[PDB]
Scaffold this active site. Structure first.
Site, short mmCIF file in Angstrom:
data_model
loop_
_atom_site.label_atom_id
_atom_site.label_comp_id
_atom_site.label_asym_id
_atom_site.label_seq_id
_atom_site.Cartn_x
_atom_site.Cartn_y
_atom_site.Cartn_z
CG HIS B 42 -0.30 0.24 2.50
ND1 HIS B 42 0.08 -0.79 3.33
CD2 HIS B 42 0.05 1.39 3.13
CE1 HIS B 42 0.63 -0.29 4.42
NE2 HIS B 42 0.62 1.03 4.33
CG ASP B 88 0.57 -4.21 2.86
OD1 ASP B 88 0.39 -3.61 1.78
OD2 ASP B 88 0.93 -3.62 3.90
CB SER B 185 3.22 2.03 6.11
OG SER B 185 1.97 1.92 6.77
N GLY B 186 5.60 -0.02 5.70
CA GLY B 186 6.69 -0.50 4.88
C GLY B 186 7.91 -0.69 5.76
C1 LIG Z 1 -6.88 5.81 5.44
O1 LIG Z 1 -6.97 5.03 6.56
C2 LIG Z 1 -5.73 4.73 7.25
C3 LIG Z 1 -5.67 3.29 7.90
C4 LIG Z 1 -4.24 3.15 8.58
N1 LIG Z 1 -4.17 3.89 9.85
S1 LIG Z 1 -2.61 4.44 10.17
O2 LIG Z 1 -2.09 5.30 9.01
O3 LIG Z 1 -2.69 5.25 11.50
C5 LIG Z 1 -1.58 3.07 10.44
C6 LIG Z 1 -0.91 2.33 9.31
C7 LIG Z 1 -0.13 1.13 9.54
C8 LIG Z 1 0.03 0.61 10.91
C9 LIG Z 1 0.81 -0.58 11.23
C10 LIG Z 1 0.93 -1.03 12.61
CL1 LIG Z 1 1.87 -2.45 12.99
C11 LIG Z 1 0.27 -0.30 13.72
C12 LIG Z 1 -0.50 0.88 13.48
C13 LIG Z 1 -0.66 1.38 12.10
C14 LIG Z 1 -1.43 2.57 11.80
C15 LIG Z 1 -5.21 3.54 10.86
C16 LIG Z 1 -6.60 3.04 10.33
O4 LIG Z 1 -7.47 2.75 11.15
N2 LIG Z 1 -6.74 2.94 8.90
C17 LIG Z 1 -7.70 2.05 8.22
C18 LIG Z 1 -6.83 1.34 7.14
C19 LIG Z 1 -7.57 1.02 5.78
C20 LIG Z 1 -8.68 -0.09 5.92
N3 LIG Z 1 -8.14 -1.36 6.63
C21 LIG Z 1 -8.46 -2.74 6.11
C22 LIG Z 1 -9.29 -2.95 4.91
C23 LIG Z 1 -9.57 -4.28 4.47
N4 LIG Z 1 -9.08 -5.40 5.13
C24 LIG Z 1 -8.29 -5.25 6.25
C25 LIG Z 1 -7.95 -3.96 6.79
C26 LIG Z 1 -7.26 -1.16 7.89
C27 LIG Z 1 -6.20 -0.04 7.65
O5 LIG Z 1 -5.78 2.32 6.86
#
Ligand SMILES: COC[C@@]12CN(S(=O)(=O)c3ccc4cc(Cl)ccc4c3)CC(=O)N1CC1(CCN(c3ccncc3)CC1)O2
Ligand SMILES: [Ca+2]
Lengths: 51, 235
Positions: B42, B88, B185-186
């Site tokens: 991503h 991912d 991320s990454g």
């Molecule tokens: C735009 O939205 C951003 C985000 C990431 N963030 S984040 O940028 O703060 C973020 C990104 C990576 C992370 C990795 C670890 Cl180990 C811990 C915390 C993290 C927080 C939190 C969230 O709730 N979301 C939701 C989401 C998008 C939707 N999703 C899934 C969809 C289908 N199937 C599974 C999961 C979970 C992650 O991205």
């Protein structure tokens, strides 16, 4: 025998040969004489904090 | 990185940081060698054009040991999609060789069976990055590292509100205010065994940041090794 006891007393990778353990190391390393330890080849071996 | 310490000189030498034209850091990476980088799938959306940076430990102070590398080719995973976030994983081939020096060394790719048996059964692991400091915060200026306990696969699926597949794995704390976060991320998740760190997992997703009853979802590296190879041998 037994990579279960303590990684067969290896340094990195530990495997089993139906009776004894066989140690190995990551790319850029070479298995020492005792056949358990690993040693670098370059000055920047994977996995080591450049201190 | 919410909570956690700061990467002291030479401590997190495998960290990589993808930067956009705006020179901004938006994602992380893992140096698998002088020519290949391991990132999230991503992380290959949030941008148009981007470079990969190494040796950086402070995002606004010429530590003299930094260095930017362009991206010759990008190998994103085919089975990946945003609808599930499954698979991912992505691998970057640099246009010019990373010159290992202080704050710039690569991490080791372990063997599958040995990794699953002795690495991920280890108590904790190490997650690192420049991501946010609290859920609604800002990219960090300094480089951080967090010791993140391995999480029972079961609890994982329950605590989550999303299908935790076989290509991923939970890690972190239930209550404690420590987790990775946006921007991290990454980044690299590494397990330590006898003073030699291994690449066990890729920072992927989570629900919020450090939220009670939620964990850090990382990409299972062992479950992609053969792929990471066929990717470095280029394919
Ligand atoms: C735009 O939205 C951003 C985000 C990431 N963030 S984040 O940028 O703060 C973020 C990104 C990576 C992370 C990795 C670890 Cl180990 C811990 C915390 C993290 C927080 C939190 C969230 O709730 N979301 C939701 C989401 C998008 C939707 N999703 C899934 C969809 C289908 N199937 C599974 C999961 C979970 C992650 O991205
Ligand atoms: Ca800098």
């Amino acid at each position: 025998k037994l990579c279960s006891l303590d990684n067969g007393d290896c340094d990195q990778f530990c495997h089993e040969e139906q009776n004894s353990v066989v140690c190995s190391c990551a790319r850029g390393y070479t298995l020492a004489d005792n056949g358990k330890a690993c040693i670098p080849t370059g000055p920047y071996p994977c996995g080591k904090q450049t201190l | 990185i919410v909570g956690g310490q700061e990467c002291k000189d030479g401590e997190c030498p495998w960290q990589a940081l993808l930067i956009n034209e705006e020179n901004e850091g938006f994602c992380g990476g893992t140096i698998l060698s002088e020519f290949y980088i391991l990132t999230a799938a991503h992380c290959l959306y949030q941008a148009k054009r981007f470079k990969v940076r190494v040796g950086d430990r402070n995002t606004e102070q010429e530590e003299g040991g930094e260095a930017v590398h362009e991206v010759e080719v990008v190998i994103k995973h085919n089975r990946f999609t945003k609808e599930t976030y499954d698979f991912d994983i992505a691998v970057l081939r640099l246009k010019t060789p990373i010159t290992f020096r202080m704050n710039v060394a690569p991490a080791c790719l372990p063997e599958r069976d040995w990794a699953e048996s002795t690495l991920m059964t280890q108590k904790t692991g190490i997650v690192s990055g420049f991501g946010r400091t609290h859920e609604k915060g800002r990219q960090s200026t300094r480089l951080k590292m967090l010791e993140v306990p391995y999480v029972d696969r079961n609890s994982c699926k329950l605590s989550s509100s999303f299908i935790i597949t076989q290509n991923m794995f939970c890690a972190g704390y239930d209550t404690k205010q420590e987790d990775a976060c946006q921007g991290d991320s990454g980044g690299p998740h590494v397990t330590r065994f006898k003073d030699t760190y291994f690449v066990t997992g890729i920072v992927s997703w989570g629900e919020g940041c450090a939220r009670k009853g939620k964990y850090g979802i990382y990409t299972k590296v062992t479950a992609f090794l053969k792929w990471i190879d066929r990717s470095m041998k280029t394919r």
